[PDB]
Design a binder for these strands. Structure first.
Length: 42
RNA sequence: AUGCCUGAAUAGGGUGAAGCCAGAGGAAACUCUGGUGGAGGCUCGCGAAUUUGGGUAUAGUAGCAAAUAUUCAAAUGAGAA
């Protein structure tokens, strides 16, 4: 009964952590990409 | 040997390059997983070679000429494999 609560809380917390990590990664990657793209036109 | 003009052809099987998308690691750079995409001195059936049309320059013996399988009935005809 409570095993399901523990499992889904842990799963949602792990998903949240992975989401934070991937958002940080993509934000850095796209900021670098847009900077390079903006600078490549000259 | 090197050309030039105008046409035909430059096929097929396999593999899967940049680039892209989405995931996971690390502060970046960067490295892996899946997909996508469809490229090449990639493969498969000093020297040689490098498709093609037209035009245009520098003893009655040997033997039967070889490309397999012919058969039956009728017609024509002097005479029919």
């Amino acid at each position: 009964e409570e095993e399901q609560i523990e499992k889904d809380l842990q799963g949602l917390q792990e998903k949240q952590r992975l989401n934070v990590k991937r958002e940080r990664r993509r934000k850095n990657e796209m900021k670098q990409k847009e900077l390079q793209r903006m600078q490549m036109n000259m």
